[PDB]
Design a protein around this nucleic acid. Structure first.
Lengths: 105, 98, 91, 516, 97, 82, 97, 94, 104
DNA sequence: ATCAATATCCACCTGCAGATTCTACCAAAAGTGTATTTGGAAACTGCTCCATCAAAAGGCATGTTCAGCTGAATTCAGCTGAACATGCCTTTTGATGGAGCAGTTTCCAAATACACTTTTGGTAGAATCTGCAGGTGGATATTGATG
DNA sequence: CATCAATATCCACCTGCAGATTCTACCAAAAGTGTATTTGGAAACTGCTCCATCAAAAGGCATGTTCAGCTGAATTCAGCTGAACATGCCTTTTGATGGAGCAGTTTCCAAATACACTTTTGGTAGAATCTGCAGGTGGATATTGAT
């Protein structure tokens, strides 16, 4: 009748997450609400990262999200930067920063 | 008297240009030859995918940019603006790979 | 064969020097470096080689397990992930 | 010999001024200097453009076709000795293109048709031991006395050859002229061949050709089709449109036999007839382009009369159909096809036929239904666009109140309260009898027949079209003989001139077969 | 032939998420791949942490509590709190659904 | 008892001795405070995970097992406690 | 009055505390600090002695590593005295900040 | 009382094979047990990951040999691979 | 009546490491030679670290191995230190290492 | 160059918490013989894509010169190093009510395991749409240089 | 310190292009529900180990003070080696093109479970003996600062 994601008000597929947990050999048993909770967490993370990327894109006068916009979104937020401190974004570049000593006069 | 910018203005200009841009800086063929010879150093007659070479290039430039940032901070710490071998040696030693 | 056009290109052995001066300069500039010493270039080349010895060794070791001798981008993604340098966009 | 030189320096100097493309051909090929000691092993004629200049200056060419043959031989040698990825190959291709562009006005200035080297497509041979199989192209094949051919599973060489075009020598001026370009046939003009220039010099005209489609025997269906097409063209009033003649050249009575599986399952029970008689008709459409008759459309149909046992009563089926995109204008070719098929549907419905069947099966790649050697630029329609074209055909037909309605074969079977395979029409060479035999065999290994028939009909419901019309010459006996004759005589339709030559060849063959 | 290659991705889901957030914003192929890799990596990390926690506590079943604990452990403070709140609301309303 | 303000309990000669283990000869005045602050940051990093492990396990006491697991998950693997 | 040169005692202490392995920070202040931090996070908690020992040893190890980095940075700057700038430099390069 | 497994006797036997006249402190044995446990955990986890990427649901000698090659560097890796190969060929030869 | 541990001739228990592999749910199937290989590798590493610790104690005139000897053995071996780069040895301390600049 | 005050390494003796050597258990392991299942050994193959060659140009290697980057020498305010008086904050021993940790029983909501009808997503081909990279014509500080 | 002026660069903009977007239809792969089975952790009770608290004699660094020698910081000046530029040149990228590998397909035999018996044995309760460095004592020996 209704999908688990639609029943739980989520966009990510709950049953797919359940299957991935099943075949990933994490544990012998997996609960019904665990995929729902995980899908909700992933949905929140995705929504936040995409809204930050959209803000970066509209700041850069661009209407399409590019990996540069993703780098601007991820790195400008120190919380996400702590989350992804050991991950490099392809075609993301680095933030424009100049050392005080290197600055003229 | 031909026009000649002093070192520091155009230097920061190109620093900003390369920091606001994301295109690859290492040429494809020399890095590909280096990675292929290093691969055959372990096992002869290996084959490479284009996406694999792209991933190697991205990882190498990201790591090198991080190392250069660390060396820049080390040099600024030592009342200097030029990175020298002692700076990079200290950065690599305290990072943990050495 | 014909053709009437060829070049020795004796750079195959020393491909470590194949990383051009402007390339290393651009990589240093992307890191915020304002001035570069003359001995930085060969040391950075050696560091790049060491990083290659770290990553491509794991990539090749992954490759032979799958009964294959062609390296896949997924394999090097795993090799970078296991070293704390996970790369995105090649999944 | 100064006139030929004065004609031939322009093209050769145009070739020379293409640098650095012409640079490698300025000097003789030296194996030791270029490091190619195998050049003489493969190339049997070592000579160059400097040798061509020396021969031209000394008058070694009696007539320009020798120079054309020499330059084309050099092009072929450069193409064969070097792979197409090489620089020399693309340079030779550029020189060949420049020569093709330049020689035509110069070659025509002397009174010749053109200066192109034209070779036919490779001729696929046929097997002899099996008498049913053929010799595959671009594969190893066996030959003996150049008359017997054998395949792998039935001298060891590979079938990769090109047949050059024939030449006809002028009776008056003695020039060697192509057969195809001016469309000269010995049967039509036994007195001899006279070039256009000689005819215009003496204010003479070519003898009237009575080996034409217009002089073919007239048929009521062909006359109806031709006058309907002429009326439609007059209504359109296209400046590029011409006159179209449609003639029915084949009409014979044949009988189709029930296949052994169906014969055992139903015929042996006294429920179905042993055979269904029918009349097969083949007609072609011819148009006058530049005063030349050209075949551009053809049809093969089977007509079952009232004397035929049911359920084939008053049914017509289109076995095969083919067309060539050389009709003028291009835009009205499709409309002319609409008019031809609507005319046929009106004729069959006036005769008394009530049902029409169309099989929307596009030709496979490398396969020709009627006209052999389809032009390379003619795109083969996909099944979806072919079905859309057939739907447009049906819409145009119903728009004229000629066809009452149209339905797919699955819908027609559903409306016809079909309960068994006996009620389906039985046609010669149709896919339905073959798939029914396959289903019978599958049941042999394993209402079951009816269920399999329903499943197959639903699977291929969009392929077969059923039309409800009423509601409330051994050379053309099949498409195999014409294709075999075209392959043997190199009657290709890949170009306008080749298509016209094939049209005259088939018209002459039909005229000669008419008289016995 | 049945030679149709198949590969799993969250492309349509993240696309619908974007239209839920930014209807007038698109995603490039490189950006789509980066997002898919990020989702896969975070999923693997959080699921492995949950499995590790369950194994350490002699738990053979994965429920929402250990996933919430893993989120608190590895996800950053504000992000972890917001994700925990949204997941709790989602599972609570799914229970009554 | 909610005891407060024992950061001065991180003895200054104790920091000097710890730096002596680190091979340092001379220590400035603010080094003691900086080491106290970084130690506090590390304590915030570790005790948070330890208390989370304790809470998930339905326990009201902190054991060395959870402490060593938190340290090892933090990239600071410790031995001697299984 | 006999007095040693400034530095000789520093070398003596460096050798003594590099030869030994016994824990240098006092047990009771560290345990009290751990108690205060736990109370600041979540009230009514208890700590095992082994947990306190593990925390103490890990803290000494981390601080010793930080001291190595700080000393190396100070020597790099042609200096023998360590200053906080070395500490934040080492922490920033380590990626902790 | 819940059973608490430890590798004490095996480490002691290895010592007697190597250093018959050497003692062991209680703290050192716990360090040995922790080292064995976490090394085994790392090898098993990375081997399971490797089987996961290659869509393999069985842990065989190849995956764990690859895991040893990846984690242990150089001479220890080669020696472990050699001893594992001889052990497995002896096991399959019996 | 021959146990697999004696058949392999290795000190480490093959059945015990097989059971540990089964309990961790690394995969739904575990090969027969996998516990043997794990036991061999763990025993080799243990033997190397124990002989290094015994040697370090011998240079220290100590016949009892202590965690300080463990730190001396691990940190004096380059590849072993690389393997345990992010691992702290309890009651181990640090190696005596002071720069030549610091010396007077 | 010699010398007196200190810390270092070391030989040697002794009480003791801890490392090592006996005796018996038993249940959690550890080992072994069928029935069963199945990831995988193995061969032929359609389909990707990986190695290789030619031209355009977007760049890369070289010589010149110089005021700033770096490096060497000198001096100083101070502060942290060394020494010492006073002592007090932590150690260890020993004991204790009890909050809290963990051993054992039961079983009911939750998860497992198919069967099945329901729905659902990744791909192949169609054709319209669109965000974005260059470049030509302004044009905007800006910094080196002139004054 | 105010401004003649060449130039990298941002926006005002635009027109062309590969890619992101929109649509219809196909079909194999998930997926929710139903039915039957299994189970494991929450409640319920309870034995017990070690967490927290108390108390006192005692000491060795904790705390504070005092004297001063080096030491980073500041300053100045000099050798110089990278930065910016102009020049000659040259290596690269993409397009196109042969076959080398990568999975899809089909057979099926060696190999890993489930579980029923059958058997070795690792902490560990319990107690008596060997063992090696913690701690203290004493005098040989480098160390060092300035006599």
């Amino acid at each position: 009748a209704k999908t688990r994601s639609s029943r739980a008000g989520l966009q990510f597929p709950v049953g797919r997450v359940h299957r991935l947990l099943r075949k990933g050999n994490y544990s012998e048993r997996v609960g019904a609400g665990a995929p729902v909770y995980l899908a909700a967490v992933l949905e929140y993370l995705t929504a936040e990262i995409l809204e930050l990327a959209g803000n970066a894109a509209r700041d850069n006068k661009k209407t399409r999200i590019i990996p540069r916009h993703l780098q601007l979104a991820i790195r400008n937020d120190e919380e996400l930067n702590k989350l992804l401190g050991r991950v490099t974004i392809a075609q993301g570049g680095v933030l424009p920063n100049i050392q005080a000593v290197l600055l003229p006069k | 008297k031909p026009h000649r910018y002093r070192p520091g203005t155009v230097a920061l200009r190109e620093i900003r240009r390369y920091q606001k841009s994301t295109e690859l800086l290492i040429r494809k063929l020399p890095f590909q030859r280096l990675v292929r010879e290093i691969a055959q150093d372990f096992k002869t007659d290996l084959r490479f995918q284009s996406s694999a070479v792209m991933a190697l290039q991205e990882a190498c430039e990201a790591y090198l940019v991080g190392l250069f940032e660390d060396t820049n901070l080390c040099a600024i710490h030592a009342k200097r603006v030029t990175i020298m071998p002692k700076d990079i040696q200290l950065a690599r030693r305290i990072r943990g790979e050495r | 064969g014909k053709g009437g056009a060829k070049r020795h290109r004796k750079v195959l052995r020393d491909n470590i020097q194949g990383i051009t001066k402007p390339a290393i300069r651009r990589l240093a500039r992307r890191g915020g470096v304002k001035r570069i010493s003359g001995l930085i270039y060969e040391e950075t080349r050696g560091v790049l080689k060491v990083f290659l010895e770290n990553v491509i060794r794991d990539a090749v070791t992954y490759t032979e397990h799958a009964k294959r001798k062609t390296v896949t981008a997924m394999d090097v993604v795993y090799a970078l992930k296991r070293q704390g340098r996970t790369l995105y966009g090649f999944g | 010999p100064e006139e030929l030189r004065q004609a031939l320096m322009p093209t050769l100097e145009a070739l020379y001024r293409q640098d650095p493309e012409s640079l490698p051909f300025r000097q003789p090929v030296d194996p030791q200097l270029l490091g190619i000691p195998d050049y003489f092993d493969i190339v049997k004629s070592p000579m160059d453009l400097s040798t061509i200049k020396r021969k031209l200056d000394t008058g070694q060419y009696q007539e320009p076709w020798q120079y054309v043959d020499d330059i084309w031989l050099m092009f072929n040698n450069a193409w064969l000795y070097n792979r197409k990825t090489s620089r020399v190959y693309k340079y030779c291709s550029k020189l060949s293109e420049v020569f093709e562009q330049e020689i035509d006005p110069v070659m025509q200035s002397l009174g010749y048709c053109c200066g192109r080297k034209l070779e036919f497509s490779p001729q696929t041979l046929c097997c002899y031991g099996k008498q049913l199989c053929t010799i595959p192209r671009d594969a190893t094949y066996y030959s003996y006395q150049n008359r017997y051919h054998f395949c792998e599973k039935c001298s060891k060489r590979k079938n990769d050859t090109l047949d050059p075009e024939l030449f006809v020598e002028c009776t008056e001026c003695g020039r060697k002229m192509h057969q195809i370009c001016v469309l000269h046939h010995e049967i039509i003009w036994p007195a001899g061949f006279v070039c256009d220039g000689c005819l215009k010099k003496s204010a003479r005209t070519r003898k009237e050709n009575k080996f034409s489609a217009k002089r073919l025997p007239s048929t009521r269906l062909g006359t109806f089709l031709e006058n309907r097409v002429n009326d439609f063209l007059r209504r359109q009033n296209h400046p590029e449109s011409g006159e179209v003649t449609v003639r029915v050249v084949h009409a014979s009575d044949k009988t189709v036999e029930v296949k052994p599986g169906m014969k055992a399952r139903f015929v042996d029970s006294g429920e179905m007839a042993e055979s269904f008689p029918y009349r097969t008709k083949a007609l072609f459409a011819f148009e006058e382009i530049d005063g030349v008759d050209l075949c551009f459309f053809g049809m093969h149909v089977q007509e079952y009369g009232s004397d035929c046992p049911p359920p084939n009563q008053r049914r017509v089926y289109i076995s095969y159909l083919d067309s060539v995109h050389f009709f003028r204008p291009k835009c009205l070719r499709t409309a002319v096809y609409h008019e031809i098929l609507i005319g046929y549907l009106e004729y069959v419905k006036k005769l008394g036929y009530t049902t029409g069947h169309i099989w929307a099966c596009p030709p496979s790649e490398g396969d020709d239904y009627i006209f052999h050697c389809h032009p390379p630029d003619q795109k083969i329609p996909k099944p979806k666009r072919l079905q859309e074209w057939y739907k447009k055909m049906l819409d145009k037909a119903v728009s004229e109140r000629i066809v009452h309605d149209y339905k797919d074969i699955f819908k027609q079977a559903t409306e016809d309260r079909l309960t068994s395979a006996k009620e389906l029409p039985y046609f010669e060479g149709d896919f339905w009898p073959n798939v029914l035999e396959e289903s019978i065999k599958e049941l042999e290994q394993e209402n079951d027949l009816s269920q399999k028939l329903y499943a197959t009909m639903e699977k291929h419901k969009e392929v077969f079209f059923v039309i409800r019309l009423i509601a409330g010459c051994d050379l053309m006996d099949g498409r195999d003989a014409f294709l075999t004759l075209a392959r043997d005589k190199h009657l290709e339709f890949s170009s306008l001139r080749r298509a016209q030559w094939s049209t005259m060849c088939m018209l002459v063959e039909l005229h000669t077969q008419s008289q016995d | 032939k049945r030679k149709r290659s198949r590969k799993e991705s969250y492309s349509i889901y993240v696309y619908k998420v974007l239209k839920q957030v930014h209807p007038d914003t698109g995603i490039s192929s490189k950006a789509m791949g980066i997002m898919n890799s990020f989702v896969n990596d975070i999923f693997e990390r959080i699921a492995g942490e949950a499995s590790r926690l369950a194994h350490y506590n002699k738990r053979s079943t994965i429920t929402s509590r250990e996933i919430q604990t893993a989120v608190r452990l590895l996800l950053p403070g504000e992000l972890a709190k917001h994700a925990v709140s949204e997941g709790t609301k989602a599972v609570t309303k799914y229970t009554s659904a």
